[PDB]
């Protein structure tokens, strides 16, 4: 047999872990991304691209370190090591945030390899590849927020930096500038993620309490681990309970386990649409009726106008050192204050 | 008749009712029904509610110019504090509407009814003779509601610090809360986040795996009821690519090799999570805030170096000063 | 013409109507706030 | 406040068109049984 087939069979051998063709893209890209983050939160600075400190070497604890995005003066640069901005010099390349693009691109390729790994395993076992389809929700999220959005703004500077507090900063920046909570697609996302956790808890509890042979000296033994369950309980019991409490229940197990797949996945997809909308700075910030009524009448207050005042504050007090490359300097008689209202 | 009491007890405890109405349910319907009738009337047509006691009101009703997203049931006045304020303690109907009476009616009946829902759950599961523990899994959203509607107000000293019942009202409460207590860096809120993302994730995993393995399902049906043989066919093989990833992570962490630990773990994850954050919201009720770092990095010249924590402190300061009409002389405060 | 041999019927049962109508009417309540502005 | 004359038409069409679509399929498959 030809050399291709020998090679192909050896990639598909029975091992502790399957390598497969998808492994060839998966393992280097994933390992190098993961190591890149590990050496960055441990040695690499951010002192020349944000004026912040985020390294164990600089002295910081687990929550305040990050591998940080490049400057705004780099534009949409790919930041290659051999490219014409670091020109083959390692120290400059770590200092200029080139390690950020390293992680982002290698992690995208790791995600591609992983969905391909799910297909490959599904096809050699011969099951339907539904778990790969489920894994398109993370990919949607990832390519919309770490790649598509910064490619719409002005640089990679507004891309979300890899880090704990660095992502906590993303939340306030979105809350203040775009008013993300008022966007309907994010509303649909919050409902979907909470709905997924809701089905998780309810399923987990009501299968646990309706088992066949919870006493009786259970005389069933197999297991048959791939079934996961879904014969170790009586469906009829479950239905008959829920159909009395909430007044509706499932009666078909297949559609239950498809609804569980459907809900949190659709959630993330709607939010992924929402944030690719923000990339063009197409946001819903306000309702036009409330603004005209509030301009015509200032004895009008709602919880929504209130949100507008708070957002107005977030921006002006965070921006002068969140965005230091803009060189905002704001006197303390122009910064917003509640007691001036 | 058989003298109505005997008929009445059979009627209540019957499980041949289309909707079970237990002895918890007997308290539950009046309370929940009162709560919802008051809620929809108040949401549509409750006149603006003074909430800082200075005679400046806020409109939350729909006939006063809101839509679905900006409307709310506005909480009780700050003057009232934690006083119990039924309608017969007011002296007119218009002043009970001006001080934010109804909000208290709704939440008190809602908490009673939602507790009786848990009771009704436990009772029905006791009648069918099954392991009654659906109720302890529900005790997590219930614990959460106690924490957010009853306890954080008590801790701060007023029901004016409660969560509004409206869409943008919740967003306002969240933002102000982050401003005064720094919830993100509270480890318990982090456990909460982890729990609900992990719940969603395990829901998708479980669903996807199960619907790929099912083949055909059929159970015998009769013209009045159901059968007694539940047929089920599934796939019963898996490979060694879900043995290094699934097999030797789960057999090692579940502490069992048994399939019955799957569904035990599925419910344990988000329930523990929501308990933890429900506990955390209460500890900030007595003002035990989360970690915050200012000036954790200084150079040997004696100049301060900033870090991300300080940027979040700046944004928090920005929100927090905007929230304070009351005075510009405030040094160290709350409660 | 001569009948198409690939002619199959189309189904929709009651519970799908309930679910589907719920989704339509609910989606309207969410986006109507933004249409009216 | 200015509320759109066309916001109402969007609302109206958004509900009425899909609802009558699903309903017609349902009554069609009910006459398929009887």
């Amino acid at each position: 047999r030809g050399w291709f087939d020998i090679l192909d069979d050896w990639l598909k051998r029975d091992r502790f872990v399957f390598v497969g063709w998808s492994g060839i893209l998966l393992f280097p890209c994933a390992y190098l991304a993961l190591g890149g983050w590990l050496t960055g939160t441990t040695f690499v600075t951010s002192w020349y691209t944000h004026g912040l400190a985020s390294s164990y070497l600089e002295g910081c604890n687990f929550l305040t370190v990050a591998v940080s995005t490049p400057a705004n003066s780099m534009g949409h640069s790919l930041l290659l090591l051999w490219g014409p901005e670091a020109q083959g010099d390692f120290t400059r390349w770590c200092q200029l945030g080139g390690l950020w693009t390293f992680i982002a691109l290698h992690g995208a390729f790791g995600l591609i390899g992983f969905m391909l790994r799910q297909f490959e395993i599904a096809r050699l076992v011969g099951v339907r590849p539904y778990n790969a389809i489920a894994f398109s929700a993370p990919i949607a999220v990832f390519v919309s927020v770490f790649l598509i959005y910064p490619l719409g703004q002005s640089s990679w500077f507004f891309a979300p930096s890899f880090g704990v507090a660095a992502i906590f900063r993303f939340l306030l920046f979105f809350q203040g500038f775009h008013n993300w909570t008022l966007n309907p697609f994010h509303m649909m996302g919050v409902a979907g993620v909470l709905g997924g956790a809701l089905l998780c808890a309810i399923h987990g509890a009501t299968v646990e309490n309706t088992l066949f042979q919870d006493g009786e000296g259970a005389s069933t033994f197999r297991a048959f681990n791939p079934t996961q369950a879904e014969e170790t309980y009586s469906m009829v019991t479950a239905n008959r309970f829920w159909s009395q409490i909430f007044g509706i229940a499932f009666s078909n197990k297949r559609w239950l386990h498809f609804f569980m797949l459907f809900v949190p996945v659709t959630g993330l997809w709607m939010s992924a649409i929402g944030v690719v909308g923000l990339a063009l700075n197409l946001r819903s910030y306000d309702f036009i009726s409330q603004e005209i009524r509030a301009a015509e009448d200032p004895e009008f207050e709602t919880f929504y106008t209130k949100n507008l005042l708070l957002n107005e504050g977030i921006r002006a007090w965070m921006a002068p050192q969140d965005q230091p490359h803009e060189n905002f300097v704001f006197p303390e008689e122009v910064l917003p204050r509640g007691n001036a209202l | 008749s058989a003298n109505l009491w005997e008929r009445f007890c059979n009627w209540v405890t019957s499980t041949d009712n289309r909707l079970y109405v237990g002895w918890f349910g007997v308290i539950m319907i009046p309370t929940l029904l009162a709560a919802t009738i008051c809620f929809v009337i108040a949401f549509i047509a409750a006149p603006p509610v003074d909430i800082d006691g200075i005679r400046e009101p806020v409109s939350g009703s729909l006939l006063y110019g809101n839509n679905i997203i900006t409307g709310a049931v506005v909480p009780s006045s700050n003057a009232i504090g934690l006083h119990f304020y039924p309608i017969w303690e007011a002296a007119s109907l218009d002043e009970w509407l001006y001080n934010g009476g109804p909000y208290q009616l709704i939440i008190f009946h809602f908490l009673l009814g939602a507790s009786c829902y848990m009771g009704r759950q436990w009772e029905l599961s006791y009648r069918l003779g099954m392991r009654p523990w659906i109720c302890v899994a529900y005790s997590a959203p219930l614990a959460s509601a106690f924490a957010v509607f009853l306890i954080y107000p008590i801790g701060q000293g007023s029901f004016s610090d409660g969560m509004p019942l409206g869409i943008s009202g919740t967003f306002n409460f969240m933002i102000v809360f982050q401003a005064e207590h720094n919830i993100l860096m509270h480890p318990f809120h982090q456990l909460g986040v982890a729990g609900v993302f992990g719940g969603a994730l395990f829901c998708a995993m479980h669903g996807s795996l199960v619907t790929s393995s099912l083949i055909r399902e059929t159970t015998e049906t009769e013209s009045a009821n159901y059968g007694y043989k539940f047929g089920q066919e599934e796939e019963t093989y898996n490979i060694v690519a879900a043995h290094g990833y699934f097999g030797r992570l789960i057999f090692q962490y579940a502490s069992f090799n048994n399939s019955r630990s799957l569904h035990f773990f599925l419910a344990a994850w988000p329930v523990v999570g929501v308990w933890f954050t429900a506990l955390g919201i209460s500890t900030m009720a007595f003002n035990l805030n989360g970690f915050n770092f200012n000036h954790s990095v200084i150079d040997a010249k004696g100049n301060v170096i900033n870090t991300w924590a300080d940027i979040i402190n700046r944004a928090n300061l920005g929100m927090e000063v905007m929230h304070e009409r009351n005075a510009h002389n405030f040094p160290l405060d709350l409660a | 013409m001569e009948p198409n041999p690939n002619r199959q019927p189309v189904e929709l049962n009651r519970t799908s109507l309930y679910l589907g109508l719920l989704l339509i009417l609910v989606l309207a309540l969410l986006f109507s706030s933004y249409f009216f502005n | 406040m200015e509320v759109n004359q066309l916001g109402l038409i969007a609302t109206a069409l958004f509900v009425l068109v899909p609802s009558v679509f699903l309903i017609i399929l349902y009554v069609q498959t009910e006459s398929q049984q009887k």
Binding site: - | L62 | - | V3, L8
Partner: peptide, 28 residues
């Protein structure tokens, strides 16, 4: 204009609740 539309859509949800409880499809 707007508020009538809001309450009408609400009213038909709660009607749909009633229909799903007391008129479900008999599963045979």
């Amino acid at each position: 204009m707007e508020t009538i539309t809001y309450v009408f859509i609400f009213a038909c949800i709660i009607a749909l609740f009633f229909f799903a409880i007391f008129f479900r499809e008999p599963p045979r």
